[PDB]
Amino acid sequence: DKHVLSIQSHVTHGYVGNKAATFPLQLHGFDVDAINTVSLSNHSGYPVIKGHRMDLEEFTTIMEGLRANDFLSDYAYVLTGYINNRDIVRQVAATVAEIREARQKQGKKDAVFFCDPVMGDDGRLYCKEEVVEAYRELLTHADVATPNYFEASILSTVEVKDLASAIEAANWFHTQGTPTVVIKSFADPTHLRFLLSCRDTGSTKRYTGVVPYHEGRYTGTGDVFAASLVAFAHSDPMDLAVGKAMGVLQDLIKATIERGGSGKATLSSRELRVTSYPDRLQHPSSVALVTPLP
Amino acid sequence: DKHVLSIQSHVTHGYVGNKAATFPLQLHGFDVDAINTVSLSNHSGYPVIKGHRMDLEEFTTIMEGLRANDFLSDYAYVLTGYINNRDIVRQVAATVAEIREARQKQGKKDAVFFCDPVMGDDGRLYCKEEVVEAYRELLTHADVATPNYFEASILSTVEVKDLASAIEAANWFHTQGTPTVVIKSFAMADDPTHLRFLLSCRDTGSTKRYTGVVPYHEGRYTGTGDVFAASLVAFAHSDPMDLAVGKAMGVLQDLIKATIERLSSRELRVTSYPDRLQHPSSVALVTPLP
Numbered sequence A: 001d002k003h004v005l006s007i008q009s010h011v012t013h014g015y016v017g018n019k020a021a022t023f024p025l026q027l028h029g030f031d032v033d034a035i036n037t038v039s040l041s042n043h044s045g046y047p048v049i050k051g052h053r054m055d056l057e058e059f060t061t062i063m064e065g066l067r068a069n070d071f072l073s074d075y076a077y078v079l080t081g082y083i084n085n086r087d088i089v090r091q092v093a094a095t096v097a098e099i100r101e102a103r104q105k106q107g108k109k110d111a112v113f114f115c116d117p118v119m120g121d122d123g124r125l126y127c128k129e130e131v132v133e134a135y136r137e138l139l140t141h142a143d144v145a146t147p148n149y150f151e152a153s154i155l156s157t158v159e160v161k162d163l164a165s166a167i168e169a170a171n172w173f174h175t176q177g178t179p180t181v182v183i184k185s186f187a188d189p190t191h192l193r194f195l196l197s198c199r200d201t202g203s204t205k206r207y208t209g210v211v212p213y214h215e216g217r218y219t220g221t222g223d224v225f226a227a228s229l230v231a232f233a234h235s236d237p238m239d240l241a242v243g244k245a246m247g248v249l250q251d252l253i254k255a256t257i258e259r260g261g262s263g264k265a266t267l268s269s270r271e272l273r274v275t276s277y278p279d280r281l282q283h284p285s286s287v288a289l290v291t292p293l294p
Numbered sequence B: 001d002k003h004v005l006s007i008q009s010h011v012t013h014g015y016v017g018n019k020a021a022t023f024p025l026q027l028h029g030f031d032v033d034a035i036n037t038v039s040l041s042n043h044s045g046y047p048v049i050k051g052h053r054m055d056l057e058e059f060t061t062i063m064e065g066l067r068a069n070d071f072l073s074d075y076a077y078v079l080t081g082y083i084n085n086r087d088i089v090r091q092v093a094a095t096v097a098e099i100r101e102a103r104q105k106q107g108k109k110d111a112v113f114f115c116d117p118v119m120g121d122d123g124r125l126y127c128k129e130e131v132v133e134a135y136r137e138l139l140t141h142a143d144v145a146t147p148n149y150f151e152a153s154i155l156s157t158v159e160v161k162d163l164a165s166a167i168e169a170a171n172w173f174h175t176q177g178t179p180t181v182v183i184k185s186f187a188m189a190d191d192p193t194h195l196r197f198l199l200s201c202r203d204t205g206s207t208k209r210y211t212g213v214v215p216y217h218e219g220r221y222t223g224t225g226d227v228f229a230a231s232l233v234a235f236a237h238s239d240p241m242d243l244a245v246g247k248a249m250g251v252l253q254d255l256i257k258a259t260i261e262r263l264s265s266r267e268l269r270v271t272s273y274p275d276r277l278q279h280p281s282s283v284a285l286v287t288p289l290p
């Protein structure tokens, strides 16, 4: 059951995409089968970024290898992150559907598809325009979505500025056909607030909580968060899984600042210290409270 | 300090190349910077292999980004494994030379280049043809080489069948310019229940040699070399090379036994006993030869 197909970026330097997601999932006892959508020198925050990008043909080629070897029924979980390719984003829906069919033919429980719609952050799109719409279409097929507040804003067309606006953005996701939505953080300038929204019933259960806001811009935080969320949600209800994943991020951001990745440090300095405290990836030193809304 | 550039394969399914190497090195506290020479569905033993292979331009393009962002002096270790491309094998020499330069300019400890000359196993050359000659050239620049007995044999032209012949093959690597050689295992006609390893350390022109055995476990495994070289880089960071070989051998013995108790089934269970990757249940004896 602890087998994930993870479709995200690969970077040589630093910690984003599959490099960031893989180590935490492995520590939690998951086999991570990674399809690397790009193979780049580093994340898009650096003045230079070089390397290879998948086209649709490269993606369907990997899929043929997985299909022919009868590996598709293995994937209890599908996790998508950085793709930044309209054709490959569109193709994920067929990939997930083909996995669901292979699992049913093997008498396995249905897969769970976690979609992190990786498009941008700090108010800037760092992925192409056509990709926004392809994510709206893919999200109709996702079980869980983990947008940052920028992505939630551009998908729903609702400016996520507060709890109320986060809820309207999350209701859009549910109407779209995504049952479970985490808006991972949004605007007490010393804390960030998050929303978990679960639509069955036609009813929606909603939860909130807060985490300390650390001064500085981090990269890879969403990627570690979604990987952590898959790992905890395998054996926790989603509210607890969110709280534990928030706790993991707090430990990792604090370790990064301690090793000298403050607000004013270099991009290299601010790379998440994903490997520094492996025990704290499985067992965070705090678990954020995730409290029902009325 | 604990920063490795790892030039090996990526596979979606299973545990070879950077999939065998990365999790152990991360558990030991190393940042692993991976260049994925291929991105394939699975290792070469399955009925179907699909995926992307780098060309030279793809490799030198990645290098361009690493150079441009000033990352090259970070690499205290360079670890190469599966490449299976003559042009990239030859390019590694320039990549190491540029890292050596960047670290010397910055007054850092000399980089250590661990070359695993990945070409074949089980008597079969699963990699291309003139890759062999390219590895003989690259090995002129290696600090540590970790061939299997097949690779040691094809590179040196000595059939490695015992300790005498392992020493002849190692001596070839020393003459080519690699000071430190691990021939990871060979069978012995005269000792069928054991695999023997050799560690050979050329200095004065003197050579210190060490040997020992592990049990010869039934069956055929993949990823064993890749986890061995990664573990060796990890242990050799703080341990003398003899004790480092001993611990790496112990790690592999725990993994093979953990694989035996659990092709899809004979994949190395690399992530199943994270404790055993750092602190193996036992270390192999690695004893000096007189």
Ligand SMILES: Nc1ncnc2c1ncn2[C@@H]1O[C@H](COP(=O)(O)OP(=O)(O)O)[C@@H](O)[C@H]1O
Pocket: A120, A121, A147, A148, A149, A183, A184, A185, A192, A194, A211, A212, A213, A214, A215, A216, A217, A218, A219, A220, A221, A222, A223, A225, A245, A246, A249, A250, A253
């Ligand atoms: N500056 C920060 N201070 C505190 N927590 C943060 C900070 N940046 C990120 N996080 C944590 O990382 C998680 C994911 O980060 P977020 O910015 O929401 O996603 P992304 O990295 O995808 O843009 C948040 O839910 C929060 O727990």
Ligand SMILES: Nc1ncnc2c1ncn2[C@@H]1O[C@H](COP(=O)(O)OP(=O)(O)O)[C@@H](O)[C@H]1O
Pocket: B121, B147, B148, B149, B184, B185, B195, B197, B214, B215, B216, B217, B218, B219, B220, B221, B222, B223, B224, B225, B226, B228, B248, B249, B252, B253, B256
């Ligand atoms: N059948 C086996 N029994 C015991 N140890 C083995 C066996 N196969 C591999 N090993 C271990 O794994 C290490 C690397 O395997 P080896 O076969 O020498 O290289 P490769 O996997 O590159 O061919 C060996 O040094 C040894 O510790």
Ligand SMILES: COCc1c(CO)cnc(C)c1O
Pocket: A009, A010, A011, A016, A017, A038, A040, A042, A043, A044, A045, A082, A118, A126, A219, A220, A221, A222, A223
């Ligand atoms: C700022 O970098 C964005 C980014 C992310 C997600 O944070 C993931 N992969 C790659 C390749 C990226 O460039």
Ligand SMILES: COCc1c(CO)cnc(C)c1O
Pocket: B009, B010, B011, B016, B017, B038, B040, B042, B043, B044, B045, B082, B118, B126, B222, B223, B224, B226
């Ligand atoms: C077992 O197949 C051999 C192999 C290895 C070395 O184990 C490494 N990478 C790839 C891509 C391989 O196919």
Ligand SMILES: [Ca+2]
Pocket: A121, A122, A148
């Ligand atoms: Ca963010």
Ligand SMILES: [Ca+2]
Pocket: A139, A140, A141, A142, A176, A177, A178, A179
């Ligand atoms: Ca739906």
Ligand SMILES: [Ca+2]
Pocket: A121, A122, A217, A218, A219, A220
């Ligand atoms: Ca960010």
Ligand SMILES: [Ca+2]
Pocket: A118, A121, A148, A222, A223
């Ligand atoms: Ca993100």
Ligand SMILES: [Ca+2]
Pocket: B121, B122, B148
């Ligand atoms: Ca072998």
Ligand SMILES: [Ca+2]
Pocket: B121, B122, B220, B221, B222, B223, B224
């Ligand atoms: Ca083998």
Ligand SMILES: [Ca+2]
Pocket: B118, B121, B148, B225, B226
């Ligand atoms: Ca090998």
Ligand SMILES: [Cl-]
Pocket: B161, B162, B163, B164, B188, B196
């Ligand atoms: Cl012998």
